[PDB]
Amino acid sequence: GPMVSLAQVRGALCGALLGDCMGAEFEGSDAVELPDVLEFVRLLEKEKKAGTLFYTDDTAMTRAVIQSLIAKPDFDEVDMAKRFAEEYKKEPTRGYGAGVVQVFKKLLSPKYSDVFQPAREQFDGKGSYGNGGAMRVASIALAYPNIQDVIKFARRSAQLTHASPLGYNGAILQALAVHFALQGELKRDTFLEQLIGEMERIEGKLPFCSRLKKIKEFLASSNVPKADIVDELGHGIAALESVPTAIYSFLHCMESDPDIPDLYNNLQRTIIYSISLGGDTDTIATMAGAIAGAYYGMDQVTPSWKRSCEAIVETEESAVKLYELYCKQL
Ligand SMILES: Nc1ncnc2c1ncn2[C@@H]1O[C@H](COP(=O)(O)OP(=O)(O)OC[C@H]2O[C@H](O)[C@H](O)[C@@H]2O)[C@@H](O)[C@H]1O
Numbered sequence: 546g547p548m549v550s551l552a553q554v555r556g557a558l559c560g561a562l563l564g565d566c567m568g569a570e571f572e573g574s575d576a577v578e579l580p581d582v583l584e585f586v587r588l589l590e591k592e593k594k595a596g597t598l599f600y601t602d603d604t605a606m607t608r609a610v611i612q613s614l615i616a617k618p619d620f621d622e623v624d625m626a627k628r629f630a631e632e633y634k635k636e637p638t639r640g641y642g643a644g645v646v647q648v649f650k651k652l653l654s655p656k657y658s659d660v661f662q663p664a665r666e667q668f669d670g671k672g673s674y675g676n677g678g679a680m681r682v683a684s685i686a687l688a689y690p691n692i693q694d695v696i697k698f699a700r701r702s703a704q705l706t707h708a709s710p711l712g713y714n715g716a717i718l719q720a721l722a723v724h725f726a727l728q729g730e731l732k733r734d735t736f737l738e739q740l741i742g743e744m745e746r747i748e749g750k751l752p753f754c755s756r757l758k759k760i761k762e763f764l765a766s767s768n769v770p771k772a773d774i775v776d777e778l779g780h781g782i783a784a785l786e787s788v789p790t791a792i793y794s795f796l797h798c799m800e801s802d803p804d805i806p807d808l809y810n811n812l813q814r815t816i817i818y819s820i821s822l823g824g825d826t827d828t829i830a831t832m833a834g835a836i837a838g839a840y841y842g843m844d845q846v847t848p849s850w851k852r853s854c855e856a857i858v859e860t861e862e863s864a865v866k867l868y869e870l871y872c873k874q875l
Pocket residue numbers: 601602603640641642643644645646668671672673674675676677678680706709782825827828
């Protein structure tokens with residue numbers, strides 16, 4: 546349908562920033578109540594001062610990825626690794642995982658010449674199964690039209706910290722989700738078909754595909770409890786329990802949720818619903834918000850919501866530069 550607009554590249558970046566900043570406020574609290582979320586959102590819209598919400602590691606790594614792609618459009622993983630590690634070093638308290646810290650320490654030492662190696666040594670050679678690969682990967686889909694490029698650069702961006710296939714395939718799936726959200730206004734069943742299609746290839750036991758199948762099920766039900774969603778899809782720091790959950794959040798909120806006032810637009814709905822799931826609300830909201838931002842575009846990123854976020858202005862700016870990458874690759 547559409548060729549991809551700047552509105553959609555902005556959409557996706559602001560969506561992710563929103564999901565980070567807002568979901569951070571409920572993170573690690575795993576009983577979250579939708580009433581608390583709505584109450585927070587109302588308070589947010591009335592805030593007199595701007596920039597009251599600070600972003601976390603999710604956004605910090607995101608901006609590193611973007612500065613790398615801008616600087617090295619061809620994709621330079623050494624450059625990207627350098628940016629990750631210096632970002633960590635500049636702002637180490639933004640919320641990073643306890644494991645991934647050790648990667649940044651290693652990459653910052655003279656001791657390593659292979660940038661993938663520290664990630665390979667995580668957890669006894671098995672590598673991290675965490676969602677930190679996925680939480681930052683969106684920009685790959687915004688910079689690279691060609692799905693092949695999206696897959697291999699998602700893998701490789703992720704592999705700088707997440708050496709387990711659980712870790713890097715989560716990053717691929719989340720980057721795919723954004724890719725297809727972008728390519729016109731796809732229908733729910735087509736969107737899933739695409740994702741199952743690509744992940745059956747990439748994976749083939751079949752963890753992500755089975756979660757993705759589980760998702761197909763849930764969208765054929767109506768009034769699915771949050772318990773059931775959390776039970777099957779998860780709401781965890783593990784990529785396997787967050788990426789599919791974020792994807793489900795996005796698809797669900799294409800339609801009305803009886804419990805969320807219809808005066809909230811689709812992207813708002815998506816963020817509110819993500820946070821209501823609890824767990825790692827931060828990373829799930831940032832991922833779902835990126836998919837939703839790519840799909841509905843900037844028009845659903847409301848002035849009252851976005852003015853609350855740290856670095857909103859810089860985010861909007863960076864999207865123009867991402868957009869130019871995208872346009873170059875066509
Ligand atoms: N293979 C493994 N073996 C044992 N434990 C693991 C393994 N993989 C992960 N863990 C556990 O997973 C934890 C995180 O793995 P990390 O690779 O540090 O971090 P991230 O970048 O994925 O970020 C994950 C979230 O954390 C932040 O809030 C971010 O904002 C994300 O929301 C470890 O400390 C382990 O207990």
